[PDB]
């Protein structure tokens with residue numbers, strides 16, 4: 001670590017602090033994550049190989065004095081800050097479409113290697129001036145497990161099967177999270193901003209209807225399912241994400257299917273008619 005000069009704090013991650021830093025030998029500007037177990041070393045070392053243009057590059061893994069440091073590629077802005085900055089006008093639909101398309105390419109790659117993210121949220125979607133968007137913290141949930149600073153870990157993008165106690169969840173959990181983020185880019189408001197596990201689940205039920213054996217076979221046997229849940233009717237997506245067109249509403253409905261087995265895959269989502277006119281615009285960024 002004597003090879004890095006801290007520049008400024010990026011923030012407090014889930015596992016530890018993130019700093020912008022400079023590599024004294026190569027002159028490289030990086031993001032350095034300080035994490036404070038052998039199985040974790042092996043799982044993290046496997047992520048160094050999982051390289052894709054829409055995945056934030058893991059440059060190096062450093063284990064010293066029982067501390068673990070992850071050295072990542074640096075990007076100047078995250079999607080949460082970009083969405084806040086674009087709140088008055090909204091992000092233009094061609095840019096939302098380009099970002100969703102790129103994130104689906106990222107997901108299709110990681111899922112093809114049987115690697116899940118498990119904790120997608122706007123905070124870990126990073127953007128550059130060229131119009132690219134990249135997934136950060138890919139694979140860290142499986143490798144490691146409130147934050148170290150006691151901050152509450154957000155539930156807003158958590159798939160219903162996790163909330164219902166599924167132990168062996170699938171790549172479909174990442175498609176759910178990305179559907180929630182797509183809806184938030186379009187409407188400029190979080191889709192399901194729950195502030196507890198039951199509030200998160202009931203917000204989902206109030207919009208998509210309380211799930212039953214018809215739409216989700218096996219749901220009533222899930223560990224945290226309760227027959228006493230209130231029974232809410234489903235809402236139309238035309239009310240949930242206006243002014244998204246019919247192609248975007250159809251794709252969103254497939255990314256938010258209750259049954260993880262029915263939920264669209266990233267590969268099938270890339271073939272959806274919503275992406276017939278996709279382009280790569282450049283965002284307006286002030287750094």
Ligand SMILES: O=C(Cc1ccc(OC(F)(F)F)cc1)Nc1cc(C2CC2)n[nH]1
Nearest residue numbers: 008009010031072073074075076077136
């Ligand atoms: O999280 C950001 C955006 C960002 C950049 C600069 C920020 O402000 C600061 F300069 F630090 F004062 C604050 C936020 N990037 C970033 C994070 C990562 C790796 C850890 C995942 N790689 N790249």
